[PDB]
Amino acid sequence: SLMERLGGGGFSARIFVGLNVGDKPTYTIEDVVKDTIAIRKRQGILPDASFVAQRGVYTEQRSGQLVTENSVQIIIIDLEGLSKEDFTGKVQALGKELREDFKQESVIVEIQERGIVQDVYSITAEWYE
Amino acid sequence: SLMERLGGGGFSARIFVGLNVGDKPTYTIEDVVKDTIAIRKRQGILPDASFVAQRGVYTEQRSGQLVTENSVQIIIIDLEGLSKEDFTGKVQALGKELREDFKQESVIVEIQERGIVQDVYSITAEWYE
Amino acid sequence: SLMERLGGGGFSARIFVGLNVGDKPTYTIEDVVKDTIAIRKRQGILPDASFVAQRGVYTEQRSGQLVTENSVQIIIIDLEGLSKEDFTGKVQALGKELREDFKQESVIVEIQERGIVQDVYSITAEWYE
Ligand SMILES: CSC[C@H]1O[C@@H](n2cnc3c(N)ncnc32)[C@H](O)[C@@H]1O
Ligand SMILES: CSC[C@H]1O[C@@H](n2cnc3c(N)ncnc32)[C@H](O)[C@@H]1O
Ligand SMILES: CSC[C@H]1O[C@@H](n2cnc3c(N)ncnc32)[C@H](O)[C@@H]1O
Ligand code: PRO
Ligand code: PRO
Ligand code: PRO
Ligand code: NA
Ligand code: NA
Ligand code: NA
């Protein structure tokens, strides 16, 4: 076998997406898998990724209610040697669309470069209050 | 949606907790979820976190017996902008209490700052020998 | 309990192994657990590790077919204080043998030092074309 060392700036990302809508279990990990593939194909990027099922705990920002839910951690290692701005923008857009598609209050996105965190973002719904 | 960049020093942690007591499967991931919420509430900290079910392999330190068990990886991203000492102390205390509550020989705690590991600790029972 | 800080250079690794052979679901996480234990014992190293079940998406390199499969993320924290070359070589050998044993096109290996990525490798089959 060939031991090929990966090219580029060493970008990776983690995205956390919950599967409850408020206190109601609603979605599944496979829904997130399929939606992520579809979004990434429309970006023209290789969709390759890992999806980890989790239990998650989140405090709702408006009401303060604590929710325990199923959630998904998406792990993306860049295998295409994208620029920092290109990778970051595509991951941000993916997180923003996942938030809408799963009707979520918040999606967390972490961007790394050689494992060093460049940015942690909370993508937060602007539902009118 | 708002793309809010997270504040503070960028602290996060990972805690590994097994669910066997010796060679006996005993606990579940939901037990760890509930106990973690309870401990973190008593610390006055937001309990928000992710919990990953795993299979784990561990060599018992006294007997050398190899155990294969279910285990839990707790992933904590600090969203409250705590100081390094405050975050580290609260995570250490959480790990120490989880070790007791689940009757474990060892719990592993990793503390990161912007993804860079600051400390890896093995929290080890002092059972008399 | 004792809060023991871990010794050595702070090495860790992640290995991603799929469980499909082409488009056919074939293997299970427990198969990977058992095979990893066996390989690491023959290396003379402590086998201790974590194994995370995942859904994975991979683009086959020859045909371009997109596969969705079950997969495993192996997480290894070095608890024995190995040298960089010793740890790296043993993890590389483990990944290469897992690729063969599970008839895989590609296995991904990431090596970290204090969380900073030193190398990401794709271990790729050299099947004749
Ligand atoms: C943002 S809410 C969606 C999911 O993100 C994860 N999550 C939320 N807050 C945190 C946090 N501070 N640390 C780790 N994971 C979190 C949990 O898995 C949750 O189900
Ligand atoms: C400390 S024993 C509890 C759990 O920690 C994890 N674990 C133990 N040792 C290691 C190691 N060296 N690397 C990664 N995970 C480990 C395994 O999931 C185990 O079930
Ligand atoms: C290498 S194919 C084996 C497994 O590796 C993981 N994988 C493949 N490519 C990527 C990638 N670019 N980022 C993250 N995980 C990936 C997926 O879980 C897959 O099932
Ligand atoms: O967005 C929601 O409504 C729930 C709570 C956190 C993520 N899932
Ligand atoms: O502590 C115990 O007894 C088992 C072995 C490792 C963690 N769970
Ligand atoms: O190697 C294979 O055939 C499948 C596709 C990626 C990993 N598992
Ligand atoms: Na890939
Ligand atoms: Na949160
Ligand atoms: Na161990």
Residue numbers in the entry:
A (entry chain A), B (entry chain A), C (entry chain A): 1 to 129
What does the paper say about this structure?
Svi3-3 represents the first structure of a phage-encoded SAM degrading enzyme. Svi3-3 forms a trimer of ferredoxin-like fold alpha–beta sandwiches, where each subunit has two helices on the outside and a five-stranded anti-parallel beta sheet at the center. The subunits pack in a triangular manner, forming continuous beta sheets with their neighbors and are each in a ‘velcro-like’ topology where residues 2–6 at the N terminus of one subunit form beta-sheet interactions with residues 120–124 in β8 of another subunit. Prompted by DFT calculations producing high energy barriers for a hydrolysis reaction within the active site of Svi3-3, the TLC assays and NMR show unambiguously that Svi3-3 is a SAM lyase forming homoserine lactone and MTA.
